[PDB]
């Protein structure tokens, strides 16, 4: 039912963080100024950082869902889940062990994000166009989304992250 937040968007996918917030990969989104979800610019604002694109609608587009916590990446070693969807409607929860930050070239830009190692169990990975799918993990009792899928390397993936932490500190 968290899978219902992951929806086809542009040439990739997107995720509903809340009823007002929709995040996706910048490199798969429709052109700047395109009417989406029956909403035109003015009904929503747009912010971005690297390949992370964030839509905020003044009116709720998804009433059925509560706000999920969005955080700028996560601790290294934490096993997250990339919620991958396909055109056929197939759902693939890929376990990814998040690691260090790195840079990569997607289109005409060099973008940054937190890398991750795809975990093979004992029983394929991502394709281009899985881009925009969310990286989620459970924080004790609470679900947290930490970023959107950017790309896979030539078992390493990388997710675009976003957000200014609530806590601020110090001036060395």
Numbering used by the authors: 4 to 126, 132 to 162, 165 to 182
What does the paper say about this structure?
Whereas ORF2, ORF3 and ORF4 each encode single proteins, ORF1 codes for a large polyprotein (∼190 kDa) that is processed by the virally-encoded protease at five specific sites to release the six ‘mature’ non-structural proteins (NS1/2–NS7)—and an array of functional precursors—that are required for virus replication. The viral NS6 protease present within the C-terminal half of the polyprotein performs all the processing, including its own autocatalytic release from the precursor. Norovirus NS6 is a cysteine protease with a chymotrypsin-like fold: two β-barrel domains separated by a cleft that contains a Cys-His-Asp/Glu catalytic triad similar in arrangement to the Ser-His-Asp triad characteristic of serine proteases. To this end we extended an inactive MNV NS6 construct (which incorporates a C139A mutation to knock out the active site nucleophile) by adding residues from NS7, which is immediately downstream in the polyprotein.
To investigate the structural variation in substrate recognition we also made an NS6 chimera which interchanged the residues P4-P4′ of the NS6-7 cleavage junction with the sequence of the NS2-3 junction from MNV (NS6 4′ 2|3). NS6 4′ 2|3 crystallised with two molecules in a P1 unit cell. The modelled monomers start at residue 4 and end at residue 182; in contrast to the other structures reported here, the A chain lack density for the tip of the eII-fII loop so residues 162–163 were omitted. The A and B chains each extend their C-termini into the cleft formed between the bII-cII and eII-fII loops of a neighbouring molecule. The packing arrangements are distinct but rather similar and, once again, lack specific contacts that are consistent with productive substrate binding.
